[PDB]
Amino acid sequence: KLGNVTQILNRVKVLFNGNPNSTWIGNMECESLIWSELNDKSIGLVHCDMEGAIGKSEETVLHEHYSVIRITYLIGDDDVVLVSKIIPTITPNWSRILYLYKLYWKDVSIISLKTSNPASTELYLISKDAYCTIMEPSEVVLSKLKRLSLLEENNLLKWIILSKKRNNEWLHHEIKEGERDYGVMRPYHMALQIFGFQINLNHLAKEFLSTPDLTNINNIIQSFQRTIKDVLFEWININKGKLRLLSRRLVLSWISLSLSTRLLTGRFPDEKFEHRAQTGYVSLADTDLESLKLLSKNIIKNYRECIGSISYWFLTKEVKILMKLIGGAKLLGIP
């Protein structure tokens, strides 16, 4: 996008010898390779953004965090800064990771970002000062770890809840202010555009909604008309797979119309659509077809009345895409 102004493509070095098992933090091969290639250079920052999988147990998470600490000890010189991400859980045996980080570092800070999800317990740890002197196998360390005192745990819970609440309030205020403003994006969006990133609204529409353009209201209208005619024709023509596919196609067409008309006119056709999307599902009813002018015909409405309303529930991976599309429509279209 920038045209290699800063030569960023010439300053990324990949640590990989061809063996897949040398890329995973838990394995010893990864540590051996990293130490082999980075023992003779100076590393000031170690940034570890975990995959954050939910399948892994607490023991594996502790092992991976300890391995990251070992790597930082091995290759990091003095005044090295370690940045890591943690996902605390409701299960009470969760503060052992905090105890470990306190044990191996002297200046540990914990941050809850306002740009992160305010409905999830995602925190960032920053560590600066090395404290320990002896590094030993993982088993004895993981057996050594314990919980923390209850008073500090309750203080941490209260602080986490307060920070999450204030972050959510800031998020709501920022969304409202962005939707109100005429034609100027927020300063962080301007910075991201300057740095070389691209707006993803068109891409998300293209490989999500299969709509090449959202600005062209007309072609989207005729697309929905043919889609509804064909889906009703097939529905009376009668399976489970066909019903699911046809319902999904109709949902995508309806979402395309909603996003396009929000971008062009400034208001969603259905007021409850945004709240339902926040819940994670979308519904199209007889009333929605009856609402707007000349989208369909009376026979189409009567045919739809034999089914009433359809309600499709998405996976979180698609709920995120819906959220991004709605945000782009609200923050890039007219007020």
């Binding site: 409905a119 203080n155 962080y188 910075a191 300057i194 609204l201 709920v319 959220m323 923050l331």
Partner: protein, 79 residues
């Protein structure tokens, strides 16, 4: 001119960090010491990423990294 504009925004955004400045309630220290996962309102601000949209969090951590990270050394990224 693109590099100049990048440096210009870098220079101007020091008093305010693109409106993402941290408050006192966000930073805590261990020594000086319920949300539900079904909501994704935060993703309505993730509008500048095709493969990964998590380039907005780095812009916020950039303040602390400016403060505490040496700028004359190399960097390692894991995961």
């Amino acid at each position: 001119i693109n590099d100049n504009c990048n440096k210009d925004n870098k220079g101007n955004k020091i008093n305010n960090f693109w409106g993402l400045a941290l408050k006192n309630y966000q930073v805590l220290k261990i020594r000086s010491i319920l949300p539900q996962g079904g909501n994704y309102l935060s993703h309505q601000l993730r509008l500048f990423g095709i493969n990964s949209t998590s380039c907005l969090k780095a812009l916020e951590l950039s303040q602390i990294l400016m403060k505490e990270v040496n700028k004359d050394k190399d960097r390692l990224f894991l995961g």
